[PDB]
RNA sequence: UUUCAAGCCGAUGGAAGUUUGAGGCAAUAACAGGUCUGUAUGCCCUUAACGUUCUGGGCCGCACGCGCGCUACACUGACGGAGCCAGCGAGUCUAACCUUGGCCGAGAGGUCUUGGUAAUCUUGUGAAACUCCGUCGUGCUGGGGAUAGAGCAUUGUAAUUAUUGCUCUUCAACGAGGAAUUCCUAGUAAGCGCAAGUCAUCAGCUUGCGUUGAUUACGUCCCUGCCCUUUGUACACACC
């Protein structure tokens, strides 16, 4: 449906075709995906998949202190900024994005004391939006802090090496890591 | 209109504009002796100086309040843990600004005194206030 | 030349001043817009009349948010700045206040002998600096 | 501190020091452990004996100090 | 100690328990109790007080 | 109105001093605004059971319930005085 | 009149709803004023959603004590909301209910039934708030 | 779905689900568990004095180690101005809480006058997180804050030892911490203010409250505690 009354999901191409199927633009799960602000700085960019998991992972992690008073602002204001900078839907993009860092077949960790038993276990669908999501943002607010950057550049940047496919992105590169252990010892 | 029709922060700047026209509102040179010995740079609206904004604000919270005490337009009506507190005991730098303001605003008629304590607003001063909140309400629209 | 003992120049006016024994990081500012020039500007590129009106504030008074303001001074009579206090005068006084009341017991003047606080604050696990 | 309206003078050491003052200067330290009192003009000279916890630490009382406490 | 009605200053006679002597944190709106410690048992007496 | 209030213990008490009012000084001549409930004059706080010693882990929660009514009466005529006849129920504290 | 209730976190939306003008009353003083920064685009959200647009059709008229911006903006909406299927037109008003129900459209915290929600702290043994602890499949 | 049992799994209806959330309840007994400093109390003791009174100094000592809290190493933001908002509780019975009006004046600070409230008033929208906008631009700084020195109150006797705090000035350790270890299961930790309790008077504590509020269990292999059945015993002052 519409997000802050302009954009929706009518002007939007959808890619991974299951992700139809269980999470839906209604409200579970809400397909409209933007993040990327700190104070006032129009950057270049937008993006972070699923506004409800945005509320989830991306609150706690930051990198912000306070919790959803900031997080609202981070959301909203950054959607002018794709808007005329690539003039696209700063939903579609990331469209692209969510699936890409999302894993079809994820490992489990059972610990038998200092041993890391990395089994594989199906994903498929829900767990791979917030998890995927917590990529982003674990990945997020370590670079904020360990190099000049804010939270609103990070996340920014990030998303479309994530979407194309980069090394310089962490959370199509920890999907890599995490996929293909599974399908190894499987 | 009325003082709610403008906003809060631009009402304050606007109505101080025609507050340093009337001979009657002085600096008594309070707030040249903080602002500069800081470090703080405050452009024309932020600026104050000083008793101008100041009286514009005080002035705009008998509108919306109404009832009275100098003392109760000083700090809003008790809480004053922040910043610091003065009720009974001898009055501060918050104190001298307060009791100069609504005497120079009483030497004009915008402020009266009502006989429950302190202060209302009354003819000249409402005229002041809300004929200023609608030429700033014509350049909002 | 502004300070005794001390000049400045060349680096940012509120970094060059923090070099004085009387003028600090969050107390350089203070005196800085008192002359009106803005804490980006360096120190040689002040013009004659910025350089005239910082040292006046200065070696003069400071203030912050001071609306009730007497000039009293210690009452003992050995010297008396008590306006503001520069490098060359703030190493005399408060060195020899301190050894007066040591001379005589005054139990700050014991406190200084020993090395523990003279305020008094907290004393059990503070005493690391002092 | 109280200066303005009763300065806290401890009106035992008035007595002490009209009595010691004008005899002869004593040479041996007096004790007086008082703290709160304000210091007058005819205590000076004569060695008051304040303690501290562990120790003492001899005064020598100016016409310079009187104002303050012993403090 | 304490419950002689002349003290030498002002503030010297403090407060004290009338069961025991203790001293140490008593109550104003209750003169009795040790401490904390008969608060709560002269409330399984009777009654109640916040 | 001339306040009358009253206050007791549990609520056995208060429901026969409370209707009595209504029944035997209100009439016709007495317009009372009426017999309330309100809140309780009440006063709860939670504490630990043991009063300080051994034992972190105990509790027990206190109150003191003591259940006010008003009952206001409003006309101050011939029939305020007849509120004497009543003083039954000793546990009520009735106040004037 | 028609009015009705409506809170979370604590709040008194008293909801006065009236045919004839449309103004937008909140306390004494209007909408615009009441709520200056951002999320009072909330208390205009319930007028335009039952299908026809609002200051030509009906009045609203509240009063409001207790709640934050945060708060306030859904107590006004959900009193508004709940003095919408308890009005009276000429089929009438009370299928709005599933309309309401249907604003916040199948994960059901609607604008029919309430926030019911009440911030208060943070809780001991294991990781807690609201919405149970550890699932691989959420 | 399960034997067409009990139950589970999810869904509908509603403000609220599987004892709704949180208190209150602690069986039978054991640990010769702790309390003789609460009072009560057997017996042992001491009695010109392990009684009593006066006052000071100690409990704040220190040359290191251990445990628990508080605060920071930051743009996770700081600094200046403006603006929007909660709930639980307190307040003389003859020393209250507090609104007001003027006057000392570098602070901690009450005699007096007037008005409200016995809790209708008052503490509390001069309530933060947060939001708007601007500036600083990653440097021990515009970071952080210990410590020291410098101007006073018609009372709280009075604050050197041993009070908080307000303005200028002093501007450290510290730049995310080894071996190792603890807590955090769905509005009840984190983060955030606000109020009570003792109190003439010294909170970061205890006690109570609301606001904004989530990452993650596939699975019990290993670890620690507890329960049931089966199983070996030479174990029995409690099964050191």
Redesign the interface.
């Known amino acids: 449906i519409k997000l802050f ?1 302009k954009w929706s999901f009518e002007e939007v191409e959808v890619k991974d075709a299951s992700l139809v199927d269980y999470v ?1 633009v ?3 799960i809400f397909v409209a995906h933007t993040a990327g602000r700190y104070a006032n700085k129009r950057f270049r960019k937008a993006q972070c998949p699923i506004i409800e998991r945005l509320t989830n992972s991306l609150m706690m992690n930051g990198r912000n202190n306070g919790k959803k008073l900031k997080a609202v602002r981070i959301i ?1 204001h950054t959607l002018d900024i794709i808007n005329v900078l690539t003039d696209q839907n700063p939903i579609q993009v990331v469209v692209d994005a969510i699936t890409n860092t999302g894993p079809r077949e994820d490992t ?1 960790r059972v610990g038998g004391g200092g041993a890391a038993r990395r089994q594989a ?1 199906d994903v498929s669908p ?2 791979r939006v ?1 998890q995927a999501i917590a990529l982003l943002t674990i990945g997020a607010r370590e670079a904020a802090f360990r190099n000049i950057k804010t939270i609103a550049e990070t996340l920014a940047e990030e998303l479309i090496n994530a979407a194309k496919g980069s090394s310089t992105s962490y959370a199509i590169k920890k999907k890599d890591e995490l996929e293909r252990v599974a399908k190894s010892n499987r | 209109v009325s003082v709610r029709d403008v906003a809060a922060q631009d009402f304050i700047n606007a109505y101080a504009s025609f507050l340093q026209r009337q001979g009657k509102l002085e600096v008594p040179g309070y707030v040249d002796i903080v602002k500069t010995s800081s470090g703080n740079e405050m452009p024309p609206q932020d600026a104050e100086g000083w008793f101008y904004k100041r009286a514009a604000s005080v002035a705009r919270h008998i509108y919306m309040r109404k009832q009275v005490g100098v003392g109760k337009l000083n700090k809003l009506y008790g809480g004053a843990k922040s910043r610091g507190v003065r009720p009974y005991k001898h009055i501060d730098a918050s104190g001298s600004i307060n009791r100069k303001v609504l005497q120079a605003l009483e030497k004009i008629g915008i402020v009266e005194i009502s006989p429950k304590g302190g202060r209302r607003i009354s003819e000249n001063g409402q005229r002041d206030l809300d004929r200023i909140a609608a030429q700033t309400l014509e350049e909002d629209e | 030349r502004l300070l005794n003992t001390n000049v400045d120049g060349n680096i940012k006016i509120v970094y060059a001043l923090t070099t004085i024994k009387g003028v600090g990081r969050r107390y350089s500012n203070l005196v800085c817009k008192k002359a009106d020039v803005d804490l980006h500007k360096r120190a040689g590129e002040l013009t004659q009349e910025e350089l005239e009106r910082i040292v006046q504030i200065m070696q003069n008074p400071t203030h912050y948010k001071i609306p009730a303001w007497f000039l009293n001074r210690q009452n003992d009579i050995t010297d008396g700045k008590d306006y503001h206090t520069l490098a060359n005068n703030v190493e005399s006084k408060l060195r020899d206040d301190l050894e007066r009341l040591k001379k005589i017991r005054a139990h700050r003047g014991i406190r200084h002998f020993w090395g523990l606080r003279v305020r008094g604050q907290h004393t059990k696990t503070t005493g690391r600096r002092r | 501190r109280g200066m303005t309206s009763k300065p806290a003078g401890f009106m035992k050491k008035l007595r002490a020091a009209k009595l010691a003052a004008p005899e002869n200067e004593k040479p041996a330290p007096v004790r007086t452990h008082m703290r709160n009192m304000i210091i007058v003009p005819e205590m000076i000279g004569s060695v008051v004996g304040i303690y501290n916890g562990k120790a003492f630490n001899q005064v020598e009382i100016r016409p310079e100090m009187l104002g303050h406490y012993l403090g | 100690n304490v419950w002689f009605s002349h003290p030498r200053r002002f503030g010297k006679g403090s407060r004290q328990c009338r069961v025991c002597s203790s001293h140490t944190g008593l109550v104003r709106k209750y003169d009795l109790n040790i401490c904390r410690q008969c608060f709560r048992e002269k409330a399984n007496d009777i009654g109640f007080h916040k | 109105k001339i306040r009358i209030t009253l206050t007791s213990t549990k609520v056995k008490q208060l429901e026969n001093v409370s209707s009595n009012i209504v029944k035997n000084a209100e009439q016709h001549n007495l317009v009372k605004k009426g017999p309330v409930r309100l809140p309780t004059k009440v006063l709860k706080i939670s504490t630990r059971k043991t009063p300080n010693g051994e034992g972190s882990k105990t509790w027990e929660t206190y109150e003191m319930r003591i259940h006010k009514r008003y009952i206001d009466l409003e006309a101050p005529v011939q029939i305020v005085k007849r509120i004497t006849q009543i003083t039954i129920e000793p546990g009520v504290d009735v106040e004037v | 009149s028609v009015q009705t209730f409506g809170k979370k976190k604590s709040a008194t939306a008293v909801a006065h709803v009236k045919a004839g003008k449309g103004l937008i009353k909140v306390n004494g003083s209007p909408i615009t004023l009441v709520e200056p920064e951002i999320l009072r685009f909330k208390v205009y959200e319930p007028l335009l959603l039952v299908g026809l647009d609002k200051f030509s059709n009906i009045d609203i008229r509240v009063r409001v004590t207790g709640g934050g911006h945060v708060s306030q903006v859904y107590a006004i909406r959900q009193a508004i909301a709940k003095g919408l299927v308890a009005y009276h037109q000429k089929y009438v008003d009370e299928q709005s209910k599933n309309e309401l129900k249907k604003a916040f459209t199948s994960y059901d915290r609607t604008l029919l039934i309430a926030d019911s929600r009440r911030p208060e702290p943070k809780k001991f043994g294991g990781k807690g708030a609201r919405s149970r602890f550890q699932k691989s499949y959420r």
Request: net charge positive; aromatic share 0%.
């Open positions: 009354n839906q209604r409200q579970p909203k489990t276990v829900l767990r917030n």
